[PDB]
Enzyme design. Structure first.
Site, PDB file in Angstrom:
ATOM      1  N   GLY B  67      40.508 -25.817  37.188  1.00 17.24           N
ATOM      2  CA  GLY B  67      41.558 -26.474  37.176  1.00 17.24           C
ATOM      3  C   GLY B  67      42.807 -26.418  36.080  1.00 17.24           C
ATOM      4  O   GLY B  67      42.822 -25.228  36.063  1.00 17.24           O
ATOM      5  N   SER B  96      37.349 -20.019  36.653  1.00 18.42           N
ATOM      6  CA  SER B  96      38.057 -19.413  35.365  1.00 18.42           C
ATOM      7  C   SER B  96      37.938 -20.448  34.125  1.00 18.42           C
ATOM      8  O   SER B  96      37.661 -19.957  33.071  1.00 18.42           O
ATOM      9  CB  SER B  96      39.789 -19.427  35.688  1.00 18.42           C
ATOM     10  OG  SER B  96      40.414 -19.303  34.481  1.00 18.42           O
ATOM     11  N   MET B  97      38.264 -21.619  34.215  1.00 24.01           N
ATOM     12  CA  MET B  97      38.029 -22.498  33.295  1.00 24.01           C
ATOM     13  C   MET B  97      36.657 -22.948  33.192  1.00 24.01           C
ATOM     14  O   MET B  97      36.300 -23.018  31.898  1.00 24.01           O
ATOM     15  CB  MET B  97      38.861 -23.669  32.958  1.00 24.01           C
ATOM     16  CG  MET B  97      38.684 -24.776  31.950  1.00 24.01           C
ATOM     17  SD  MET B  97      38.660 -24.007  30.591  1.00 24.01           S
ATOM     18  CE  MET B  97      40.499 -23.660  30.118  1.00 24.01           C
ATOM     19  N   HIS B 121      39.307 -15.091  36.559  1.00 20.63           N
ATOM     20  CA  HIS B 121      40.638 -14.431  36.856  1.00 20.63           C
ATOM     21  C   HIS B 121      41.668 -14.818  35.558  1.00 20.63           C
ATOM     22  O   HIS B 121      41.377 -15.193  34.543  1.00 20.63           O
ATOM     23  CB  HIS B 121      41.236 -14.906  38.307  1.00 20.63           C
ATOM     24  CG  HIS B 121      41.160 -16.546  38.465  1.00 20.63           C
ATOM     25  ND1 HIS B 121      40.114 -17.200  39.245  1.00 20.63           N
ATOM     26  CD2 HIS B 121      42.046 -17.529  37.870  1.00 20.63           C
ATOM     27  CE1 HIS B 121      40.269 -18.400  39.257  1.00 20.63           C
ATOM     28  NE2 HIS B 121      41.469 -18.672  38.493  1.00 20.63           N
ATOM     29  N   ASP B 170      40.258 -11.416  40.966  1.00 19.89           N
ATOM     30  CA  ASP B 170      38.748 -12.179  40.996  1.00 19.89           C
ATOM     31  C   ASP B 170      37.709 -11.377  40.892  1.00 19.89           C
ATOM     32  O   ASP B 170      37.702 -10.177  41.470  1.00 19.89           O
ATOM     33  CB  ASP B 170      38.925 -12.907  42.265  1.00 19.89           C
ATOM     34  CG  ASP B 170      39.392 -14.443  42.163  1.00 19.89           C
ATOM     35  OD1 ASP B 170      39.361 -14.938  41.104  1.00 19.89           O
ATOM     36  OD2 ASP B 170      39.587 -15.159  43.351  1.00 19.89           O
TER      37      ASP B 170
END
Ligand SMILES: Nc1ncnc2c1ncn2[C@@H]1O[C@H](COP(=O)(O)OP(=O)(O)OP(O)(O)=S)[C@@H](O)[C@H]1O
Ligand SMILES: Nc1ncnc2c1ncn2[C@@H]1O[C@H](COP(=O)(O)OP(=O)(O)OP(O)(O)=S)[C@@H](O)[C@H]1O
Lengths: 7, 192, 346, 344
Positions: B67, B96-97, B121, B170
């Site tokens: 997010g 990612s996070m 990413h 990615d």
């Protein structure tokens, strides 16, 4: 002799 | 709906919700997209457990597609500020996070499920306006990308040049590859 | 002449170790008491004051030991009473006055010699209220005895039966010393409430415990009379005891010194026990330090040290009588752990 | 014969820091004796009884006022205790014994004993706390004392007898001074009157300020507050006069260490003089001591702790030390950061 009182 | 459970104590029975019951045992759930409201709730939970016991390890289960970035960086600094070792676990997916908070856990106390999957990413953004404003916001997001790669190398142990080449697009990494990559320590296949 | 503070402390050092802060306090009182008893109520300043000592320390720190050793070197009379049996308001059991009657057995019914005596009490913490200022059921040993004792320390006269006419005698306490001290339990919780001031949840909340804070010695040092009010003691009783002595927890080095240097050190006592049997007992330096580490974990004080030694030599003591032609026995550090058995010399 | 102007000055010589209390005692003392000069002969019928109720913190001088007053006053004085008092005399004591000790001071003089003064310490001890009950120090004591305080003739064997006779010594004429430290009374008054906890912008909040809790709160005490404490209302009704004592001020403390002949510095320096070395205390040390003493909130009785603990190291090694003509103490010595410097 003594006194006892609790709950 | 959320089920209700009963905890037996010496004084008497107490009805607690499932999420609150596990919180008593230093367990926090990270579900759904990372936003400002859900993130502000987890920070209060970490602080609450620190005061109750600063010598017991905390367990953080992460199952989220990622997010907002700024919402997630608050969790990273919180885990490092508190003395207890924040154990992380990957369930379902780690975007990612979600992957950055996973690898940010205490060294030697990071585990990934046998069927879990991690994705990494570069930061996403966008802006509409004058050319002068685009340059300002472009330099800012570039700083974050550089900052996120520096910390990723710190916990994973890899070199800064390798993380940059691998995060340009990615990149999916299975559970065994995550161990070889330094992202995690072992796999929790079965209970011992 | 009278003994000097340095001379009395050199005598106490033979029986006590690692309590320098407490030895100086008792020395000034004894020196003050003898000075008060040196002049026959003649001084530049009239109405000479009386100072009462309040000994406070951890469990097994050596409080009861000081009162016993003090009576040996003290020439004036000394008594060792207890606050457990004090019965305020004349109920069944011993009464405050008993302390005075007991002081005559050591003085042999000498009023002039009894007024110059010293008094020691123990378990004074036990008579404190349960952290409540108002007493609900008129505690006999709470809001009771503590008040009853105020009159004696302040200075008054109490009738005492001379023998076991039937007339009584009056003896003043204004010029009699009292040493009321006992290991307080739960005092660290109260002190922490008033001095830590860092409780709460938050990034800027100083919460660091079990590693640096909550030290037993440091907390006691910062004690004040206002802190005892929250514990249960009455301020009037604390007012009669201005002096306060804060002892510390025995250190690892202190344990090693206490094992050998004291006259009645446990190591020497066991050697005496073994000596009559005919077998010498020697402790290797390396082994002695291991015992000290175990004692601190128990958190039982010096008294708890006996447990470690007893268990280590429990098996050897059982087999020593049946064995013969044994001259010397050596104990190793491994024996303390229990994995190995001590070697024997024939 | 009694003088309220002079008596206040006389008490000032021995007591300091309580000016309002001296005025209250002089009025009651003067009125009580004036009543006995012309007993119930005035036109005013049902004259109110003149009694005294001392109320103050620890070390405020309650026991001191009874001692100073006894020395100044000509009639015999007595100093009893409420802890010893018991009901129906099982083994402790009896209320009538208080009258026996009074005669010993008066040498069996009924005419001279009826005009005597009575002072009972630790009045709070007899507070009725019979929640969990028999009670020998509670209601039984207060009930017997109230009967005596009301005014009644009690049989007292004069000299013990060699007779089966007793004297009917009056009690309404004799004065009584009920005094003792009240612990928890402040909370009771504060509980009744707070007038705070305002969350509005206009409203004000006082967390540290307690409107002179030590002195102002006592001034606003009421009889109804003592009823919740445990005392009987009839007992308080018989004592219209109440004395309120504020906490000692830092200025008063300094005066207590210099003006009195029982001052700590005077006795301690006198003790040092016996050893052969003079003791010197500077003015800077005195005010510093006062601040530490007020922090302890123990009164004058706890003042000694600061002075003795500070001099613990000095006295310990002073005998061994030689060639020291005088001792100088600075303000830092009170704090303990710097050791005192001796003079040779
Ligand atoms: N400073 C010390 N030096 C040597 N032995 C000590 C010391 N303190 C305690 N001990 C030993 O511990 C024994 C008991 O000491 P105590 O005076 O009873 O300690 P304590 O603090 O009085 O315990 P309490 O108050 O009765 S619970 C002594 O007989 C010694 O063997
Ligand atoms: N008001 C005061 N002014 C000067 N010295 C005082 C005063 N009150 C107490 N002291 C000192 O403290 C000593 C004892 O005072 P006390 O009157 O016994 O204290 P107290 O609190 O009134 O006793 P209680 O509570 O009635 S048992 C005196 O000898 C003085 O040295």
């Amino acid at each position: 002799x003594x006194h006892x009182x609790x709950x | 709906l959320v089920p209700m459970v009963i905890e037996q104590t010496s004084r008497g029975e107490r009805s607690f919700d499932i999420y609150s019951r596990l919180l008593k045992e230093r367990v926090i759930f990270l579900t759904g997209q990372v936003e400002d409201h859900m993130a502000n709730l987890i920070v209060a939970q970490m602080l609450f457990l620190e005061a109750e016991n600063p010598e017991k390890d905390i367990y953080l289960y992460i199952n989220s597609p990622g997010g907002v970035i700024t919402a997630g960086m608050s969790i990273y600094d919180t885990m490092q500020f508190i003395k207890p070792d924040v154990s992380t676990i990957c369930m379902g997916q780690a975007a990612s996070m979600g992957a950055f908070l996973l690898t940010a856990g205490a060294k030697g106390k990071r585990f990934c499920l046998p069927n879990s999957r991690v994705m990494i990413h570069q930061p996403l953004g966008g802006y509409q306006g004058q050319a002068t404003d685009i340059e300002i916001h472009a330099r800012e997001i570039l700083k974050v990308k550089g900052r996120m790669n520096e910390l990723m190398a710190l916990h994973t142990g890899q070199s800064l040049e390798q993380i940059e080449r691998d995060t340009e697009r990615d990149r999916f990494l299975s559970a065994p590859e995550a161990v070889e990559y330094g992202l995690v320590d072992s796999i929790l296949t079965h209970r011992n | 002449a009278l003994p000097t503070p340095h001379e009395i402390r050199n005598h106490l050092d033979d029986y006590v170790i690692g309590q320098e802060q407490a030895k100086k306090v008792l020395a000034v009182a004894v020196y003050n008491h003898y000075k008060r008893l040196r002049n026959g109520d003649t001084s530049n300043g009239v109405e000479l004051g009386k100072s009462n000592i309040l000994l406070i320390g951890p469990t097994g720190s050596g409080k009861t030991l000081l009162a016993e050793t003090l009576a040996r070197l003290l020439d004036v009379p000394f008594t060792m009473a207890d606050a457990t049996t004090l019965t305020e308001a004349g109920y069944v059991g011993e009464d405050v006055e008993n302390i005075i009657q007991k002081l005559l057995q050591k003085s042999d019914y000498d009023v002039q010699k009894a007024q110059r005596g010293i008094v020691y009490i123990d378990q004074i913490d036990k008579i404190s209220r349960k952290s409540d200022n108002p007493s609900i059921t008129r505690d006999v040993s709470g809001e009771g005895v503590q008040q009853a004792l105020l009159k004696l320390i302040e200075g008054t006269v109490a009738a005492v039966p001379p023998q076991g006419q039937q007339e009584f005698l009056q003896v003043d306490t204004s010029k009699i010393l009292f040493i009321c001290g006992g290991a307080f339990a739960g005092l660290d919780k109260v002190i922490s409430h008033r001095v830590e001031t860092g409780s709460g949840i938050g990034f800027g909340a100083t919460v660091k415990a079990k590693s640096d804070k909550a030290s037993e010695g440091e907390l006691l040092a910062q004690v004040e009379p206002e802190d005892l009010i929250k514990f249960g003691l009455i301020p009037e009783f604390i007012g009669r005891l201005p002096v306060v002595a804060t002892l510390n927890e025995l250190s690892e080095e202190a344990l090693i010194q206490i094992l050998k240097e004291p006259k009645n050190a446990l190591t020497k006592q066991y050697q005496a026990l073994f000596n009559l049997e005919g077998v010498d007992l020697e402790f290797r330096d390396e082994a002695l330090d291991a015992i000290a580490k175990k004692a601190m974990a128990r958190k039982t004080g010096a008294r708890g040290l006996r447990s470690i030694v007893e268990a280590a030599l429990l098996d050897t003591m059982y087999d020593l009588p049946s064995m013969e032609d044994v001259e010397k026995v050596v104990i190793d550090e491994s024996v303390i752990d229990g994995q190995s058995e001590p070697l024997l010399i024939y």
